[model samples]
Target: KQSVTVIGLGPMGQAMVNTFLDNGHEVTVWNRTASKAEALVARGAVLAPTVEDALSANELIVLSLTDYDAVYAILEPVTGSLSGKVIANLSSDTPDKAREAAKWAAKHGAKHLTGGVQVPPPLIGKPESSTYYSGPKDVFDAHEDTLKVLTNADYRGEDAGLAAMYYQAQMTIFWTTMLSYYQTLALGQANGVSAKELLPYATMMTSMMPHFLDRLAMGAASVDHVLHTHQDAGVSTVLPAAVAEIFKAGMEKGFAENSFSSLIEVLK
Candidate 1:
């Protein structure tokens, strides 16, 4: 078990501290709001009287924060204690921010491991829950066991930005996909159809998405094939010929041998 200091004790922070203590690691924590530390303190976790105190207590630091802003707000004034420390930052932010923070860590002589939690606070200690981590390979490997107490850690690469990028991508899919379901629900609502009534059909329709995409993919290839056919069966060749006229303008402008979709870029 590795000893470490946890900075920021919000829901996720609290979850991590609880999990670390349960897993037999010596855990110390600090939060801006002192009251938030009460529950964890009662469970035997040490509460640092100051941020500097927390950073000085451990060689490894776990940061569970709201965003990069929270990280800077807390760490900027404590750079003196950061040297030779490994900072595992599990916060949401852009890839650029993560990348820049890595440079900032280097300036202060620390290793910055960017992390993105794939599950909610409730799933913190579950073996099935995973988080993305990207940073120095040796640093991650050395600390992997201690980190696994929170969740299954999936290391991406040495670039600190990768973890945050993956996290943002996961969130984009989640929000967009959930809202799509909501969109369908709203349409049904307007027609007096209940969500309970729509569940089965929605389930079936969504299940067919992969197959639907496959069939839709064939249409583009088929269209290109038809356009390339030599048969003058005028009907078979007509729309293709029509399409060529529109394509001709670019063709004349030196698209002479280039496949059109090569520019527009078809998936397959």
Candidate 2:
């Protein structure tokens, strides 16, 4: 249906090109490395001999690249023909860079709809897929049909840098939660407990996190209905001292890493 050209023929670009061609659209593809398009050329896809030639092939070009470094490395050389084209820079980049590049596009007369792309290569062709983009809403609104082949193009309303911020913030919380889970598993394994047998307790601990957070939220911190008796019993204080004692004991046994399991030194 729609005629499209795609640059950056890595797995992501190739996957997108394949989707476009499969749907009966006229597809043109180019990669900095011309050899990358070999398989696609065999399958009814047109390969551009050069970047300028590719830019002339269609109105839209989807970019999937390592970074802005690759973007300039490949695209800068072909600026002569980029004017009057539309480039959906699906290549992951920071918001500042996205905004700057959009300005560059304006100078070149190409429309830039800067947005964030999520999902792996495998999910490219699936229906109801999701991606985030930010920039001029009308530009996105106009071409959202082709975008749906990659994702549900939920416009961020504005501020094209949102995708970069959103992804980093989400990863921050995700990695911390994962680290805590692994710490629990490491403790369990140290006690000769089979990890499979520890599954129920681990599940209980994970489930209980919400309630513990709720207690902090409501300003009512107690230990499973038992209120703390004194400063001596305050886990923050007593626990550290106790952990230090454990470290002392571990060193007595001539094992540094093993003895600190109780974390008596940590309490101190």
Candidate 3:
């Protein structure tokens, strides 16, 4: 079993610590608010009194923080304790920042691994829960078994930024898809349909999304119609309007005769 230091006890961090302990790994935890580590400490996890002590506790450090900024806030002061350590940072941030953080760690004599967790706190220990990781392949391979205690580790590439990039790409799709669903619900509500009544239909539509992807000729005109419907229903047109604008731009760029996928050219 591996000994790991987890610095950050938010829901995600706490969940990770618990998963590590459950998997028979020795766990050392630290958080800005020490109270957050109470239950964990009671469950056989050691609560480090300070960040430096936490760093001293283990070579494999799993960080789950608000962002890279939080990471720097906590670790920047203790650079001396970082030598020979492997920092598996699962915090969310832009790809550029991830790369910068990796360099910062290297300069301080620590190996950095960028990680992007794909599941929420509740799914942390599930085998299906996956996280994107990137950095030196050997460093990653060294901790791959321990990392898998929390989730499936999906190694993207050698660049530390690749993990964060993949995470952000997934986020873009997730946010847009969720907002579109909310917009649909709003439109339905405006027309006197309840969410309960629309649940099945919404699920059906999303289930067919893969097939649709495997497939927009009415293109701009169709989205224009959707925008008008939302407007007429007094529902927020933000989602459909944004889509229509993109399609309109695509058409303006002379993609009127090409598949809507031609928007790729406009996007670039």
Model number with the top TM-score: 3
Q: How many backbone clashes does candidate 1 have?
A: 0
Query: What does each candidate score in C-alpha RMSD?
Result: 8.9, 10.8, 1.7
Per-residue C-alpha lDDT of model 3 across residues 216-240, encoded as one tens digit per residue: 4486777888999999998787788
Each candidate's TM vs. the true structure?
A: 0.79, 0.71, 0.94
Stretches of candidate 1 exceeding 4 Å from the true structure: 203-205, 210-268
Local accuracy by lDDT, each model:
0.83, 0.70, 0.91
Q: lDDT by residue for model 1 over 5-56, one digit each (tens)?
A: 9999999999999999998888999998989999999998999999989998
Q: Would you list the rank order by lDDT, best first? A: 3, 1, 2
Tell me the TM-score of model 2.
0.71
- Which residue segments of model 2 deviate by more than 4 Å? 193-268
Candidate 1 vs 2: which has more lDDT = 1
**lDDT by residue for model 2 over 1-268, one digit each (tens)?**
7788888888888888887877787888888788999988888899988788888988888788877788888878778778888888887877788778888877888888764666677777786466777777777887899877767776775665676556555666667666555545555565566678786787687767679561121222232122233232332333333434444454555454342233334344
Candidate 2: C-alpha RMSD to true structure equals 10.8
Q: Which structure among the candidates has the greatest lDDT?
A: 3
For candidate 3, the per-residue lDDT at 69 reads 86
